[PDB]
Symmetry: C2
């Protein structure tokens, strides 16, 4: 019983699908993160003292995470701070704390707590001045193992930097035209970052 | 310069987003599959003779794949046939060949061939009389290992059965109302299956 402008309904659907594009992507990464962190061998080789031979040289948590999966940043963090860093597929001594506006200890605690329900955490971050999706899950062995103390559990962090091409492809996956970072056009703020995502206010859907 | 019926444009967008929902889901599963199959330990423990202790009892390829990730069927196949089967998180001696309308050897060869480009395969199947997404990738060790012969490579298969609840949640993720299996309403055929997916012909987008 309520009619709407063609240009307006376009704008409303287009916001819904950009937001869905971010939520679906973020939620798939969460499950990816638990797949790598709820892993007995990971707990063995990264839970205390990280083995960069097993992780990077033997490619159990290595460059493929960037070259295939798109995680610009892969980290292992504990109470001391960043224990493993792989930035664009290459090993780094750079900390997560320097790479992000978010706090290492907040992400550590949030991830340790949701591991009790077998869940990961996620949020948006500023990563080297660009928008990014962050997921993290506690490094935990599987149920056959003895009960560990999650309070000292190390946490795995995957950072997905929303570069121009990835954003471009992301919009196409959801019927959005010219999804980009904002330097007439729709936009939304990425909460937790200084960045806004923008696109042309049109009818989302097929090319047709 | 071309105007359209409100009911018609709704129908066109709704098809686009159901098709996107299947494509995005299928493509995330493909990358999930290579994450588990392009894995040196997997090649060691599943490439010849499957170790159900390492796979199921030690939860390296175990029930979590169903209870968390949603893969109703997890298989390891070689030239002899099904070497490992986990159906709804529980170990089975049932073959993939009995579970699907698709052919074990076609899926084996397709997956072996695309492993050369570091890719997986995917398609829709009839799984116990229900629609399903199938992904598969060759079990291969990582680049540091010596060149293996993919011609004898075993292949990992993840089957995602599109049950009522999963379909229901899938539609909500894309703005579709009442996405269901077909026993007035829109529908599309799942090519490679006898099944059609149906939904109410309305304006896809937000609840608003």
């Amino acid at each position: 019983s309520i009619a709407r402008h063609q240009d307006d309904i376009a704008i409303e659907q287009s916001h819904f699908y950009v937001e869905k594009a971010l939520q679906n992507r973020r939620e798939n990464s969460e499950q990816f993160s638990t797949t790598y962190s709820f892993w007995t061998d990971a707990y063995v080789y990264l839970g205390n003292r990280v083995d960069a031979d097993w992780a990077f040289t033997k490619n159990n948590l290595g460059s493929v995470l960037y070259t295939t999966n798109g995680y610009d940043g892969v980290f292992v963090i504990d109470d001391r701070g960043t224990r493993y860093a792989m930035l664009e597929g290459e090993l780094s001594e750079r900390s997560l704390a320097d790479s992000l506006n978010a706090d290492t200890g907040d992400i550590l605690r949030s991830a340790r707590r949701a591991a009790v329900d077998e869940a990961a955490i996620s949020r948006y971050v500023d990563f080297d001045g660009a928008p990014a999706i962050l997921v993290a899950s506690a490094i935990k062995p599987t149920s056959d193992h003895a009960p560990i103390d999650l309070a000292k559990a190390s946490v795995m962090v995957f950072v997905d930097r929303l570069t121009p091409a990835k954003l471009a492809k992301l919009g196409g996956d959801y019927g959005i035209a010219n999804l980009h970072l904002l330097a007439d056009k729709e936009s939304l703020a990425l909460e937790g970052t200084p960045h806004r995502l923008a696109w042309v206010s049109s009818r989302p859907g097929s090319a047709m």
